[PDB]
Amino acid sequence: AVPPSLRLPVIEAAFPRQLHPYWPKLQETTRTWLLEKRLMPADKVEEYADGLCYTDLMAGYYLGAPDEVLQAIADYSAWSFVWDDRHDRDIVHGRAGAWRRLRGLLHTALDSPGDHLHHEDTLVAGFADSVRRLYAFLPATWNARFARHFHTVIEAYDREFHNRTRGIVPGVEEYLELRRLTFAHWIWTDLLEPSSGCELPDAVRKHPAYRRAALLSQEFAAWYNDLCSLPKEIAGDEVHNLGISLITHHSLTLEEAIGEVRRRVEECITEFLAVERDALRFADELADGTVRGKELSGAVRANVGNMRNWFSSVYWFHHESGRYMVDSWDDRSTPPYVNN
Numbered sequence: 001a002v003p004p005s006l007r008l009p010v011i012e013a014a015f016p017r018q019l020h021p022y023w024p025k026l027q028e029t030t031r032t033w034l035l036e037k038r039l040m041p042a043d044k045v046e047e048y049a050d051g052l053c054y055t056d057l058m059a060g061y062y063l064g065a066p067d068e069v070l071q072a073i074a075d076y077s078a079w080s081f082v083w084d085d086r087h088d089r090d091i092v093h094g095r096a097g098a099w100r101r102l103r104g105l106l107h108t109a110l111d112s113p114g115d116h117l118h119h120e121d122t123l124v125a126g127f128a129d130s131v132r133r134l135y136a137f138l139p140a141t142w143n144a145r146f147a148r149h150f151h152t153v154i155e156a157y158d159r160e161f162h163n164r165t166r167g168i169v170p171g172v173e174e175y176l177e178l179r180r181l182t183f184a185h186w187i188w189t190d191l192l193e194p195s196s197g198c199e200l201p202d203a204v205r206k207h208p209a210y211r212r213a214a215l216l217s218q219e220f221a222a223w224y225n226d227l228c229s230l231p232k233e234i235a236g237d238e239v240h241n242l243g244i245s246l247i248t249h250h251s252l253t254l255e256e257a258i259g260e261v262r263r264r265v266e267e268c269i270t271e272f273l274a275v276e277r278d279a280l281r282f283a284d285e286l287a288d289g290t291v292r293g294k295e296l297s298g299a300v301r302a303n304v305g306n307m308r309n310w311f312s313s314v315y316w317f318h319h320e321s322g323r324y325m326v327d328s329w330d331d332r333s334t335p336p337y338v339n340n
């Protein structure tokens with residue numbers, strides 16, 4: 001049961017949850033990876049990692065992925081949560097130089113991950129290990145696209161560092177643009193492709209129905225995170241959240257902002273249902289009788305199916321994960337799973 005202020009009946013009724021069969025092995029393998037890569041202290045891994053549910057989030061999303069593809073994705077995803085925590089702590093503690101150096105190393109490791117597998121910063125070496133594995137599944141054209149997208153993500157994190165150090169809350173529209181980058185919309189969208197075993201040609205993945213379905217899946221996920229992570233973000237002096245932009249720039253009360261975010265999330269669902277029909281019609285059109293057409297049709301169908309799965313995976317993750325349970329913490333501003 002989800003509390004009424006966060007409950008989305010359409011998700012519960014029309015987006016049934018799915019779980020990849022590799023999940024039990026994935027859970028342990030990513031936990032071990034966090035420990036062995038020294039991304040979290042051993043005691044925090046043992047106490048918190050499984051309860052954070054990072055592998056459950058990916059195993060409810062990339063259905064049909066080969067096990068080793070899912071493992072690379074789950075390691076990258078867990079890494080990205082640890083990176084969000086590092087970024088937050090660098091801001092809180094005023095470590096502008098350490099953040100700037102990490103930012104530069106991530107840009108370089110993204111282009112040459114093999115070179116960084118044994119870097120002295122374990123966060124950099126862990127990133128490089130997951131990215132090198134992701135780069136082994138599809139042609140180098142996909143790797144170049146992943147890199148282009150992630151360079152843009154790193155710079156969005158840098159912009160968040162500057163906003164928080166200056167005490168600036170972005171306006172609503174500025175925030176919505178930024179959030180497509182800090183949530184890594186295009187990375188999750190890129191990762192659909194190794195999960196279904198096919199790099200999609202530009203003409204296919206830029207078809208308006210594919211693009212719009214991909215966008216709406218991510219807008220839902222990011223704004224639902226904003227809705228559910230608002231309490232811990234207020235407690236932590238985080239400024240990046242649609243609800244915070246609405247309160248700051250449109251004078252909404254907390255209750256009014258929650259209602260507005262919820263309505264925007266709900267609309268993403270029914271806009272997605274409409275565009276999903278068009279995206280699946282496009283998948284049917286790709287099945288032109290040829291072998292390549294069958295492959296592309298099947299890949300698009302699998303990808304759109306996972307765009308749909310993201311809704312339910314993200315929904316349930318926010319109720320299951322210890323990451324958001326601010327009411328349980330000794331210090332609401334310092335989650336117990338971060339290294340402070």
Ligand SMILES: CC[N+](CC)(CC)Cc1ccccc1
Nearest residue numbers: 077080081084182183184225
């Ligand atoms: C902070 C982690 N993340 C990607 C894992 C940003 C890089 C946003 C996110 C939060 C919650 C669910 C899904 C993604």
Ligand SMILES: [Mg+2]
Nearest residue numbers: 084085088238
């Ligand atoms: Mg965060």
Ligand SMILES: [Mg+2]
Nearest residue numbers: 084160182240
């Ligand atoms: Mg963040």
Ligand SMILES: [Mg+2]
Nearest residue numbers: 225226229233
């Ligand atoms: Mg959040």
